[PDB]
Amino acid sequence: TADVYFKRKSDGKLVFTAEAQTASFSQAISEEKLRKPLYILKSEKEINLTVKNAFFDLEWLAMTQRYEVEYRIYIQFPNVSPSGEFEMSLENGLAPEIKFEALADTDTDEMAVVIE
Amino acid sequence: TADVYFKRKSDGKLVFTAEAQTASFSQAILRKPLYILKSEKEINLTVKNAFFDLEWLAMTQRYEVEYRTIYIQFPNVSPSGEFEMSLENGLAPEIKFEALADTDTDEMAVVIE
Amino acid sequence: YDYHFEVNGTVVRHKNKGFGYMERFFELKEERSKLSKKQYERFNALFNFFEKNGVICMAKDSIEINSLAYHGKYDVMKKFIEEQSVSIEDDYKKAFFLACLGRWEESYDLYSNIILNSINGCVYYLSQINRYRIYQSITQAVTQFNGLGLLTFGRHYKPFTDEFLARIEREMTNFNIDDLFNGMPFEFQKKYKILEFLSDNQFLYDDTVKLFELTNKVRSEMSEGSYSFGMSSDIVVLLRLYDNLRFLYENCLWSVSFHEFHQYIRNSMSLLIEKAEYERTRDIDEGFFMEYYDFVNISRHFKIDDIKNLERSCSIDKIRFGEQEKIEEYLVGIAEEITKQFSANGMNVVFYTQFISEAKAALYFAKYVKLSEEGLGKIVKALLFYFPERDLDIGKRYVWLERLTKCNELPKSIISIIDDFLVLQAEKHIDQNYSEVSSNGLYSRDYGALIKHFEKNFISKRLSEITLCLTQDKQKQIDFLFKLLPLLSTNAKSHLLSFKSVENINDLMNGIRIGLIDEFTPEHEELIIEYLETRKVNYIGIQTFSSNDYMSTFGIWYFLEEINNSKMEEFIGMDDQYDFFVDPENFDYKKFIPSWLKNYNDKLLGKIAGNKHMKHHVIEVLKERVKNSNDKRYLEILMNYFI
Amino acid sequence: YDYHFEVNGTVVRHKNKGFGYMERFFELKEERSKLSKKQYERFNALFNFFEKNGVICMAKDSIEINSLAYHGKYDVMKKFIEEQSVSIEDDYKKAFFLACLGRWEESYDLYSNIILNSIDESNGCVYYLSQINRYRIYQSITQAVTQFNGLGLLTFGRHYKPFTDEFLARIEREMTNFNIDDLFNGMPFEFQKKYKILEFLSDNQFLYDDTVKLFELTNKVRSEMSEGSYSFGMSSDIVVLLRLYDNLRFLYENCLWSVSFHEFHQYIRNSMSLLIEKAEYERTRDIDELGFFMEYYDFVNISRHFKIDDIKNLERSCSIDKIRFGEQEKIEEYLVGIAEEITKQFSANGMNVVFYTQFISEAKAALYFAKYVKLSEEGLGKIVKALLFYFPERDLDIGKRYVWLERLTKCNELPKSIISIIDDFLVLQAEKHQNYSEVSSNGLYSRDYGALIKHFEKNFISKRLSEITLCLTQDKQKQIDFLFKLLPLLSTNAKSHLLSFKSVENINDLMNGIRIGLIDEFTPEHEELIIEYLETRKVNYIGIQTFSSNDYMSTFGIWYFLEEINNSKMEEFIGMDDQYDFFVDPENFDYKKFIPSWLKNYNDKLLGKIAGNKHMKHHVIEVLKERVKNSNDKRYLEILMNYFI
């Protein structure tokens, strides 16, 4: 049981906090045929994360009317895109689970950082 | 979608007739001399829609089976007596039987074309 | 319960102790003149009903779903909507249709009016169920937009007026869903017994339990290898699936669009493909193909991760893809819908949330169909220009495009769409803040590489014009067009290279990727060695491991003799996949990770095999991975080059 | 629905809008002296209840099942039954135990009597539970009677009639038009408002909620194992196990007969065998750049609610030898108890049929899974003696019982006592042989027991079989050629006496002589016999085609391949079946008829020789790569890394 902290990329404001449930780390090559020359070491790096119980910051909700995530060993994803897929159950609902995918900037070309 | 006839081995009387559902034939391998080709071979058959012969039912109150599609004959079929009850009432009886093999004859099943 | 009615359509005498009415009825169906005239008039209707639904004949002796909602005819449903409803049944059809294209408010109002105007009696029951379901949809949509909507869309939408929400909260309170069948006339309860299961808040549990039992039976047959001769559990699964689809969609129930039904589909489907694929891997001892209805099912009820897992488990590109024309017009409808929506005036957010998952799934899993040039072109135009940025990032939308590229090779028309998409991306690269970020890690340079791979002589006119227009002021456009150098003309190449310098490591990677660098000049050795000096300096009680993946590239370059300067051994010890390639002998392979072997290509893998001083440890790794896992790619590596 | 309760022991806030009661209650549990004396005593009662059922705290911050029926204390329940019940509460568990031991008539009558005496019950919970269990007994009796009129005739040969005709008539009579779906509704409204949570018990399908939840959890676990994702909080597998143990403890502690129905066993076998698969996936999981062990309770669950074919399927799907086995003493005690029951019943006048169907199905799974647990010498002696002599042969024949025995032999090497027991069994089999045939579904006849004995001793000489051989006469053929297959067990004088009448007339005797080791090289007589049988086989072959599993033909082909046959007449017999042309002339086999299943049957020496042919290696390597890429058997792959055939 470990927690994640959501921040806006611009400032230090807390977007929301949650507890990480599952993290899908499945990264491999792309299609070999489609992509003598100097080796580039192509990759299709993907990291997905899911959080079970997330409550958004009250100040964040009040102000709302690029994101960073800090999963506490502590790891940081400088850019995370929340996949806002809303699927609804006929059972009345409740556990708001948020899934987000890490992103890599062209210049930085780094997706996640793991530090003790 | 063929038909299967369960017969008494000695008398030859038809114990019952049913429609085949499932058949498993899985033969696989502590157990310098001459290679004897020892093997552990089994055949299980689950059959559906079995209604027993009325004459055999009246008489009862080794087996051989013939499964005809091309043409299969299993001698020495032992009916497994597993019985499990569903809380939902009961829908047809399903009969499971295993193919037996004699030491002298050393054959398990025959296929006729 | 007098008779057993199953999926295939054969009646089974189950608990009828009296005279057999079904057997005699079927004998009469297969001498009706002796029947009374009024009795025969009823019999013709019974024949029509019993042949429209199934019930072909006795046990001893293809699916069609006709609804504009199932087929996604999002324009025909509108045209039906503005037409005046002749009767209450057509009005309830319009209710379901109105609930389909978003707009839960109008569908809820219409359901309420149908409730007041109903005085058969089953139309009221179905409308009560659908109104409760529509209120549930509006409530969870409100919760999602209030909670997650702000983070996802970046702004608060509030698709529904507060007065509407208050009124629906007041009206649906004290309405027990399970009660609603019990509190209706005894005549209806006696006649419409089969609808009782729809009354409760959970009506797929019986279907889900039967599907669990059937899936477990199918898995037992798969593992054991037994042969099923009669009506198989697999065909039972698919036929019960089709029964549920044709019962829920045709009867105009919104309960189809819920997570439970979606997840029931996702279990019942994708168990047919697993069994079908295993059927091809049947061990010989002493087929199933996908139709337009199947395409709609997977496009509707499968999440992108779900179809990804389906692809991992089974090779789905081998199963025959029939009814291709129907599939193609289906994705043509999807593409025209998304273009019409997002081309002008934003989108319908309630429509957006319901439809974007289906659009994403269909466009992703379209890898396996052959689309004509016009259909492929419009699909690509919808995919690149008009698909929302939030759902498809540059790399992931590129993956969608390159997956569409599998079945159909790139035509000139599609290359033009990629070209002006790249031109638009270059246009957006003006403000210094903007930088295309992708979850996949791949970018517009990959679009350029795709174009060059499929033509090898393409020259992009507009990007070359912008390149001739470039000045030193706009550095973002400069190092964006740097990644698109092969697309540019030779004059554009010179104009871009005038301001382009290899200042940092990433610039050298871009230069290598575009092909500007074919042999390392000593300045590149100096830059790489200086960067490694900096990495060692910042390394020297906590240690960092990032996903930059540059140190591994340097190590592999040293291994493949591309770099011929023996200062690399100083940097040995920081991160792995570097010592493995620089000095494989003293690598202490207890730290070796098998996944690295996925990242290598044919040339690198062949060189690793040919090293012969690190061959044995890696062959052990490949062996224990192929024994442990079912990935089937580690075995491909293990046997293509025996590494 | 005001609060939501997780299986972990934590409570979560959903729906209660007023003042929060359990929020204050848990903090009070963690100055409570300020309450009233009556408040204090009821708070004590609650505290006892909530920590009894596992509700520990809220979300912000193993199991035991105390029941004799779950542990199979099949004599202690008898002792409970004989004892007079002081109260109806003790009478409910006595009726449950009566049900668990067959004896469904007495269970039905006792349940009816509890129903009669439950008029003055304070709450009526025992009345409703007795009604449910009486209906369960009634359908159990109905299905058992249907089986005995059906499967009970094929099996058992005879008609049993465990329940009298008058008893059946009355129970059909009072049970007529009885809707269990109405039973909870046909109760006083005080009972319904108080025992609302027993409503799911009412309907004729009460595990559908649990089965659907298990389906969802299994799908999620499969999604994680396919994606390779890592669960950090409470894993879905842990949730499966927790709901598992909660369900077993609920329907075993409260004495419900519905635990003994096929639906519950299916729920168990699907909820289990998924934790095992998840554990095996966890073990075989590659490290990226960024264990589960079964207990005595799990052993009991697998022993009871798993069929033999289903355990076979799960061991095929995942390896279990790498899963460590704890609580081995309790598992040994349970297995010894099961063996003790089967011995005390079959050894003395047989055992009642109604309890037989319930007991023996789980006895199969217990003895089959006994391979994996480590057992003491006395326990192994008891269980082997139970499986050989006092186990009903109608289910595990000689071949399958031998497989059982070698399975319990895998973990623990054979001690002298077990070999003495097998010697007694072989003596009994020898004296059984009359026009009696040792038929088996497995094909591993009594000679395999002697082979195991010699494998674990290499010097064992069976005295009693030796004396039997000394007293053998030429009139009795079945015993003589039965002991011919048991030749290594006999003494030298017994061997000499048996060889007097033992002749290789047909090639089956040649197989028996080879297996016992009497023949180490082919004399010209043996070669001539083989050629003659091949001549008559082709003569009868030529005329529809017939394929049999006699397999002698493939044995001849393999003998030709291994150069053990050195007569060049075999090529005349080419074409009558496959796997013979495969070995005699591998170059001209036209491998479109090759069957990949053959390589599993061959041993190390045979496939090593096949590897060294090199005029035939490439076709079989193509077959092997196809099978390894397609199938997940992992035996073809093991063959591949072993010698790349």
PDB file of C-alpha atoms in Angstrom, chain B residues 22-27 40-46 65 67 72-78 80 96-101 107-111, chain C residues 224 229 286, chain D residues 397 400 440-443 547 549:
ATOM      1  CA  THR B  22     -16.800 -35.413 -25.372  1.00  0.00           C
ATOM      2  CA  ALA B  23     -13.889 -37.799 -25.871  1.00  0.00           C
ATOM      3  CA  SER B  24     -10.327 -37.478 -24.560  1.00  0.00           C
ATOM      4  CA  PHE B  25      -7.482 -39.677 -25.847  1.00  0.00           C
ATOM      5  CA  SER B  26      -4.327 -38.508 -24.052  1.00  0.00           C
ATOM      6  CA  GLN B  27      -1.391 -40.941 -24.150  1.00  0.00           C
ATOM      7  CA  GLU B  40       0.328 -44.923 -20.311  1.00  0.00           C
ATOM      8  CA  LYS B  41      -2.705 -44.520 -22.560  1.00  0.00           C
ATOM      9  CA  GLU B  42      -6.242 -43.639 -21.473  1.00  0.00           C
ATOM     10  CA  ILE B  43      -9.556 -42.834 -23.157  1.00  0.00           C
ATOM     11  CA  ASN B  44     -12.403 -41.034 -21.387  1.00  0.00           C
ATOM     12  CA  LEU B  45     -15.821 -40.564 -22.979  1.00  0.00           C
ATOM     13  CA  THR B  46     -18.653 -38.317 -21.800  1.00  0.00           C
ATOM     14  CA  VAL B  65     -19.595 -49.654 -26.426  1.00  0.00           C
ATOM     15  CA  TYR B  67     -19.705 -45.233 -31.237  1.00  0.00           C
ATOM     16  CA  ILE B  72     -15.419 -46.758 -33.553  1.00  0.00           C
ATOM     17  CA  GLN B  73     -15.649 -49.638 -31.064  1.00  0.00           C
ATOM     18  CA  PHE B  74     -14.434 -49.498 -27.460  1.00  0.00           C
ATOM     19  CA  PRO B  75     -14.199 -52.906 -25.762  1.00  0.00           C
ATOM     20  CA  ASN B  76     -14.248 -53.078 -21.946  1.00  0.00           C
ATOM     21  CA  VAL B  77     -15.782 -49.703 -21.092  1.00  0.00           C
ATOM     22  CA  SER B  78     -16.104 -49.073 -17.344  1.00  0.00           C
ATOM     23  CA  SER B  80     -17.414 -44.111 -13.732  1.00  0.00           C
ATOM     24  CA  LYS B  96     -18.797 -40.950 -18.211  1.00  0.00           C
ATOM     25  CA  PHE B  97     -16.933 -44.144 -19.072  1.00  0.00           C
ATOM     26  CA  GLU B  98     -13.267 -45.078 -19.393  1.00  0.00           C
ATOM     27  CA  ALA B  99     -11.765 -47.522 -21.871  1.00  0.00           C
ATOM     28  CA  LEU B 100     -10.286 -50.629 -20.230  1.00  0.00           C
ATOM     29  CA  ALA B 101      -7.631 -52.877 -21.770  1.00  0.00           C
ATOM     30  CA  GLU B 107      -5.788 -53.277 -27.300  1.00  0.00           C
ATOM     31  CA  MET B 108      -7.823 -50.321 -26.024  1.00  0.00           C
ATOM     32  CA  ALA B 109      -9.984 -49.044 -28.914  1.00  0.00           C
ATOM     33  CA  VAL B 110     -10.639 -49.980 -32.552  1.00  0.00           C
ATOM     34  CA  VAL B 111     -11.511 -47.672 -35.456  1.00  0.00           C
TER      35      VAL B 111
ATOM     36  CA  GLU C 224      -7.102 -31.561 -21.572  1.00  0.00           C
ATOM     37  CA  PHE C 229     -18.595 -33.782 -31.272  1.00  0.00           C
ATOM     38  CA  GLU C 286      -4.635 -41.016 -34.050  1.00  0.00           C
TER      39      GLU C 286
ATOM     40  CA  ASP D 397      -8.544 -50.126 -11.330  1.00  0.00           C
ATOM     41  CA  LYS D 400      -4.810 -46.285 -12.021  1.00  0.00           C
ATOM     42  CA  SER D 440      -7.373 -51.759 -16.416  1.00  0.00           C
ATOM     43  CA  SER D 441      -8.174 -48.377 -17.946  1.00  0.00           C
ATOM     44  CA  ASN D 442      -4.558 -47.264 -17.560  1.00  0.00           C
ATOM     45  CA  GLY D 443      -2.608 -50.147 -19.093  1.00  0.00           C
ATOM     46  CA  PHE D 547      -6.065 -49.113 -36.774  1.00  0.00           C
ATOM     47  CA  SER D 549      -3.619 -49.416 -30.208  1.00  0.00           C
TER      48      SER D 549
END
